[PDB]
């Protein structure tokens, strides 16, 4: 399996997209980025021009005007129009994001200090996920020869330290996955950047998210609500595989 959902050295962009929702986010952000870079460059060029054109050695008697009504009507309406354009493209994206479709696969995620518990209610499967290198695996949340060995044996490298977990949430490609997120002790937050999803794990509440992964691979996330001393050390691994590789994984969990 290819490692796809991961930060890359020196990266300045988004993590690669592996869901339609993530693709929408990349487009909406790129659309807004061109606009706000245009606004910022515009404002900056105005300031640099005004400082150059009206420097005291070049303009020695200052004007005195304090109004210009065509300009003020312009610079009030054009922002309003820019923002309405942004809202028009971004509200559909928000609506696609938050309207939960019908699940092909259903996973119930519980956040703990400091690890994640997964249950597949249709399959009567449940397990816990700890960072490779956490105390659960024998470590103390730092790199070491033993931790590097465990990463290799699990199919990763030392580069995936702090992202890779001992167990992964396995899902089939091109299926609608609905995840139900809650917290067991404090608030945590479950996210996978490559899927464009993030949902807080609040004790006493069950909240839902959805994704449909569009290619196979490995995708990482990290807990995203400060939860205590090992907030930095309770990540998320998602493996997207073929329909029958997924069934194979299911069957390996079935007790006869």
């Amino acid at each position: 399996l290819e490692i796809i959902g991961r930060p890359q050295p020196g990266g300045t962009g988004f993590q690669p997209s592996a869901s339609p929702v993530a693709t929408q986010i990349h487009w909406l952000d790129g659309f807004i980025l061109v606009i706000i870079a245009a606004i910022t460059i515009f404002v900056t060029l105005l300031i640099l021009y005004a400082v150059w054109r009206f420097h005291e050695k070049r303009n020695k008697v200052p004007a005195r005007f304090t109004h210009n009504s065509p300009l003020e009507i312009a610079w009030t309406i054009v922002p309003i129009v820019i923002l309405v354009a942004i809202g028009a493209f971004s509200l559909p994206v928000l609506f696609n994001q938050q309207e939960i479709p019908e699940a092909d696969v259903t996973v119930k995620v519980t956040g703990y200090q400091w690890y994640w518990g997964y249950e597949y209610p249709d399959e009567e499967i449940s397990f816990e996920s700890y960072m490779i290198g956490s105390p659960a695996t024998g470590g103390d949340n730092r790199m070491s020869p033993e931790v590097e060995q465990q990463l290799i044996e699990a199919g990763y490298s030392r580069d995936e330290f702090l992202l890779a977990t001992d167990t992964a949430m396995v899902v089939p490609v091109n299926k609608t996955v609905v995840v139900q997120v809650t917290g067991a002790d404090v608030i945590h937050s479950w996210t996978v950047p490559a899927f464009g999803v993030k949902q807080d794990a609040v004790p006493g509440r069950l909240a839902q998210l959805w994704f449909r992964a569009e290619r196979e691979g490995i995708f990482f996330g990290q807990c995203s609500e400060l939860c205590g001393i090992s907030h930095a050390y309770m990540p998320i691994t998602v493996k997207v595989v073929s329909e029958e590789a997924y069934a194979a994984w299911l069957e390996q969990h079935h007790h006869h």
Binding site: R6, P7, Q8, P9, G10, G11, T12, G13, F14, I25, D29, I32, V43, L46, I47, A50, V51, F54, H55, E56, P62, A63, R64, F65, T66, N68, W75, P79, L83, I86, G87, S90, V93, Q98, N141, R142, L163, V186, I187, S189, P193, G196, V197, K198, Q199, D200, V202, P203, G204, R205, Q222, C223, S224, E225, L226, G228, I229, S230, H231, A232
Partner: protein
Amino acid sequence: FTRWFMSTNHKDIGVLYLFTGGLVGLISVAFTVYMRMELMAPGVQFMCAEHLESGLVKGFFQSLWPSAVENCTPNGHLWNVMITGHGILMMFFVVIPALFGGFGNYFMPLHIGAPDMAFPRMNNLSYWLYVAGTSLAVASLFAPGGNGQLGSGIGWVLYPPLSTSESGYSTDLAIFAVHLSGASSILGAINMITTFLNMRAPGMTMHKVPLFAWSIFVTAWLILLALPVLAGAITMLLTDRNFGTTFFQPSGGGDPVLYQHILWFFGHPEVYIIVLPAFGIVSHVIATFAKKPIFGYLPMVYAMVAIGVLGFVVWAHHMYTAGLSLTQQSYFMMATMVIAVPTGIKIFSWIATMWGGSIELKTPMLWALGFLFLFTVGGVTGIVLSQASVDRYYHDTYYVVAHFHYVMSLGAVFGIFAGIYFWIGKMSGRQYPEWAGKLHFWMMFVGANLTFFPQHFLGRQGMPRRYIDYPEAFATWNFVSSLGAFLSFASFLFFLGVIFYTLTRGARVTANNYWNEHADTLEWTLTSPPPEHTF
């Protein structure tokens, strides 16, 4: 003598606020230097559990030298205490005390021709509540806290149930600290509002009040509505921790998300309380050094009033991933976007003030020009984050950290520096050396941009907030960001040198108005410094 600390004159309280805010700012900036030392490289090298077994002072100095990973057991609790302490100090005990308690107490009465605040003894009490709060905040760092260590590692907004489960009583000291800070702010707001309405000089109609005084006035109203709410929110934390209540605990029918609504109902107004007096200072500074009256004085006033009001109906943009329904998410995103229109009016009117003027590029003007550019960078990423669909990715990442450092530490802080260089001659009778103010500006301009612009990249790559350590791939831009913070720190030590030089041996100020005629408010008609008893 301690005749400074018992003074009730608004000028002396303003100076006490300025200096205290500056000292606390130095402490909190020092925390960030340590933070960025640990973030400079992946793996944990400084915040080792091994350093706890030594004493407080010995373990301190061991903490500042790097260890190899194999000899360093990561101590995430110390990281969480440092960043919590850094944020609490900034948001409650540094920038509002400097802008509002400092420049507000000193110059708002001068700007309206008032001899003093309406309740001078209330003003002196407000300063001591600020120092009491500051002392509890610092004491909490050394009190028994989470995980059987010292200090509270719960973030500056104290989300439950983490904040109500954290062991020890360090968190209780932090809550008391925030109580005292709100009390100090409420007394100040009462004084500003009474003085503004009741003690203007004869002839000083409200449409003749200078913009700075307006900004303090609007800020004082936001305080009166926002801070009592915060006092409620955090008292409920105190009663869940200590008096058996269950407001935020699901076992007893509570809801942790209820706390977030109450807290952010204060939490967003808090940032407009921070920045409005900086808006006021930018207007005075830009008018002076463009040698041109402010463009659109009345839209400037109304835009500040519009921003202040809208700031109270947008709070849940801090909660897009906390379980808001689609309808709430769509409202708060649209209400938040509106704030860009009044703010843009002020940005464009500051450029319009420069336009057609005769521009003098002295140090206060450099800070104000930097403000215009850098506040715009921070404000447009705030608009990005307002899109809940995109905040899904950016929430709790360093893209948020980049946003709010551009509006706060390259925005509001630039307004603080613009004010200090603008007014130090008027307050002290001594003038700063021009070349050093310019060098301070350019060192801070380069360093602060190197510090925080790469955090946009880290956020886009998915780096979460409040992490002691990070995956290897985030190393490059974390390294650049730490170099920028070290340069920024150098620029601030140099600034403290510049202030020390100015006050002990700076060129003597002889003029009442040592700038020019377009510094046209009443403080420039008085001596430098103004007489002990005004108007």
